[PDB]
Amino acid sequence: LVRSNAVDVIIVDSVAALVPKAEIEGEMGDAHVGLQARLMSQALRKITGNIKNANCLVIFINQIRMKIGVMF
DNA sequence: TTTTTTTTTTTTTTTTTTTTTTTTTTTTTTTTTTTT
């Protein structure tokens, strides 16, 4: 959509819910340490250069997931 | 009978033998439990 120059505002609701295809194919709790993070990092690397050229918005939506082992 | 005298011209190719080198990471995820 963004590369087409047609649409100008794009919304991705709850980026946390876009599971990888590999994780879907595999069983529950197999592993997939950070695969979501790798996917998200690779996505931006490819679309940042097209978003500026197409003058679009890609407002992403996120969730609050409390972390462990943090005191202060 | 006596009695020798002088060279002239090039034609043709034939066959390949041998490898030499790696190069770079990429990414987090999720809390549990009141005690007197």
Swiss-Prot record:
Q: Where does the UniProt entry say this protein principally localizes?
A: cytoplasm
Q: What exactly does this protein do? A: Can catalyze the hydrolysis of ATP in the presence of single-stranded DNA, the ATP-dependent uptake of single-stranded DNA by duplex DNA, and the ATP-dependent hybridization of homologous single-stranded DNAs. It interacts with LexA causing its activation and leading to its autocatalytic cleavage.
Q: What name appears for this protein in its UniProt entry?
A: Protein RecA
Q: Which residues cross the membrane?
A: none
Q: Whose protein is this, by species?
A: Pseudomonas aeruginosa (strain ATCC 15692 / DSM 22644 / CIP 104116 / JCM 14847 / LMG 12228 / 1C / PRS 101 / PAO1)
| MF terms in GO | ATP binding; ATP hydrolysis activity; ATP-dependent DNA damage sensor activity; damaged DNA binding; single-stranded DNA binding
Q: Which GO terms describe its cellular component?
A: cytoplasm
From the UniProt record, give one GO term of the biological process aspect: DNA recombination
Q: Where located?
A: Cytoplasm
Question: Does the keyword field hold Ribosomal protein?
Answer: no
Annotated keywords:
ATP-binding, Cytoplasm, DNA damage, DNA recombination, DNA repair, DNA-binding, Nucleotide-binding, SOS response
Specify the domain of life of the species encoding this protein: Bacteria
Q: Which family does it belong to?
A: Belongs to the RecA family.
Disulfide pattern? none
User: Keyword Zinc-finger: yes or no?
Assistant: no
